[PDB]
Amino acid sequence: MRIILLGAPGAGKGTQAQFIMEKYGIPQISTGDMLRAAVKSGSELGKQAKDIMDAGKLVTDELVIALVKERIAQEDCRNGFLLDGFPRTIPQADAMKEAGINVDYVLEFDVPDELIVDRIVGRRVHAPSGRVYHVKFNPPKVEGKDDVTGEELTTRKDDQEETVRKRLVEYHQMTAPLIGYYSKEAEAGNTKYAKVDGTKPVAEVRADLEKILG
Ligand SMILES: Nc1ncnc2c1ncn2[C@@H]1O[C@H](COP(=O)(O)OP(=O)(O)OP(=O)(O)O)[C@@H](O)[C@H]1O
Numbered sequence: 001m002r003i004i005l006l007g008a009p010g011a012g013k014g015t016q017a018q019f020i021m022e023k024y025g026i027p028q029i030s031t032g033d034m035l036r037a038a039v040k041s042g043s044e045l046g047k048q049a050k051d052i053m054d055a056g057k058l059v060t061d062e063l064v065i066a067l068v069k070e071r072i073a074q075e076d077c078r079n080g081f082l083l084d085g086f087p088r089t090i091p092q093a094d095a096m097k098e099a100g101i102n103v104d105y106v107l108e109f110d111v112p113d114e115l116i117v118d119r120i121v122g123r124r125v126h127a128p129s130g131r132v133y134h135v136k137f138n139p140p141k142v143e144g145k146d147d148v149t150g151e152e153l154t155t156r157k158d159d160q161e162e163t164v165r166k167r168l169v170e171y172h173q174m175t176a177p178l179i180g181y182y183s184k185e186a187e188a189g190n191t192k193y194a195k196v197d198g199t200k201p202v203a204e205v206r207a208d209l210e211k212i213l214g
């Protein structure tokens with residue numbers, strides 16, 4: 001199974017990708033997690049992307065496309081994969097299309113801009129792994145600790161109010177047009193398209209997705 005998750009920053013994509021990975025056994029391919037992993041490892045990619053990300057802007061299409069193409073050529077993606085935060089622009093979607101890469105499902109996460117800024121305030125992450133929590137809506141079992149390692153949680157650098165509002169403007173400008181892009185592909189029968197109400201609690205969005213994916 002091949003799946004694309006669409007939605008504004010903070011709409012709940014990474015949270016729901018982990019259930020899909022658990023249930024259907026396909027790797028979560030999150031370009032944000034890979035880029036942050038590149039920073040964590042000190043790679044040349046990490047050196048090129050760090051300042052762009054901190055500014056809340058999008059990394060060059062050509063770089064992220066090469067990143068994804070190498071990632072999905074790996075053996076754990078042979079039987080499917082979930083794309084989380086990619087494609088992010090029309091050129092990234094056309095690059096995948098011209099490469100012959102079709103996906104089975106496109107899932108849009110619908111969340112108003114107003115909830116997102118308040119939501120991202122309480123976002124806490126196990127920075128090594130990228131596991132994501134919320135202090136109110138999806139807390140860890142132990143306040144301030146990762147459920148798996150017991151390591152202290154942190155707050156992403158780009159999750160401050162000002163950066164989050166920069167990211168939302170980039171989303172509506174560059175990314176929101178992918179809604180019509182993959183709706184057109186679905187009408188041509190090249191994928192299934194579905195939209196979920198991301199304002200609901202995590203358990204209800206999860207249930208909604210299970211009905212769609214089976
Ligand atoms: N259905 C929900 N209701 C309320 N809060 C949620 C819901 N789903 C996820 N969250 C929380 O909102 C925050 C954003 O979640 P998540 O990281 O999954 O969004 P995202 O789409 O991956 O954002 P980004 O694109 O910035 O990575 C997290 O702190 C998460 O715990």
Ligand SMILES: Nc1ncnc2c1ncn2[C@@H]1O[C@H](COP(=O)(O)O)[C@@H](O)[C@H]1O
Pocket residue numbers: 009031032033035052053054056057058059060061064084085086087088092167
């Ligand atoms: N597909 C992508 N294309 C360009 N930049 C990306 C992409 N995915 C992630 N990024 C960068 O990584 C940041 C964090 O991604 P995310 O965690 O998905 O919100 C984004 O704000 C961009 O700077």
Ligand SMILES: [Mg+2]
Pocket residue numbers: 013014030032084085
């Ligand atoms: Mg995410």
